[PDB]
Ligand binder design. Structure first.
Ligand SMILES: O=C(O)[C@H](O)c1ccc2c(c1)N(CC1CCC1)C[C@@]1(CCCc3cc(Cl)ccc31)CO2
Length: 151
């Protein structure tokens, strides 16, 4: 099918959900689980740092987007394409894309619109994979992501 898309969605979906609920999903990973597990660990370390280092900017952009419902959540894909896709690609910007998504995911829980988190993860994945596949493939995908941030 599309293994890069499938793996990307599982990783992003899980990180967003875990960020919003504060609990880990004990369900096993699908294909390429070992890598996905390392990718999630990486996001918990780096993504979490991003949300703090840029807390003020993140809080400001969130207020800007004024997210209250499903229509508002749907409006985010155009903004992601405008800001993320139309720019240089490097792991740092991909981490910001996902980190702000988690920031939004937490917001969705506060306003009791939790059922929008999964659709949101899907939208982030679409933007990332469908507009930056060449780069991702060249950078060795998630294996490369894990390698890049290795400590
Ligand atoms: O190039 C830049 O400026 C940065 O490097 C950069 C890179 C990616 C990126 C953003 C910035 N942003 C903007 C920043 C300002 C505080 C968050 C969030 C983004 C756009 C809004 C909507 C949206 C909604 C969701 Cl669910 C996720 C990501 C995003 C698009 O992802």
């Amino acid at each position: 099918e599309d293994e890069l898309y499938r793996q990307s969605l599982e990783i992003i979906s899980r990180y967003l959900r875990e960020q919003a609920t504060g609990a880990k999903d004990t369900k096993p990973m699908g294909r390429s689980g070992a890598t996905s597990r390392k990718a999630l660990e990486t996001l918990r370390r780096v993504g979490d740092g991003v949300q703090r280092n840029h807390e003020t900017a993140f809080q400001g952009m969130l207020r800007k987007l004024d997210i209250k419902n499903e229509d508002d959540v749907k409006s985010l894909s155009r903004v992601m394409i405008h800001v993320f896709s139309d720019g240089v690609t490097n792991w740092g910007r991909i981490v910001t894309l996902i980190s702000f998504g988690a920031f939004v995911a937490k917001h969705l829980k506060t306003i009791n619109q939790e059922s929008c988190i999964e659709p949101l993860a899907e939208s982030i994945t679409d933007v990332l994979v469908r507009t930056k596949r060449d780069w991702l493939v060249k950078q060795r995908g998630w294996d490369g992501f894990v390698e890049f941030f290795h400590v």
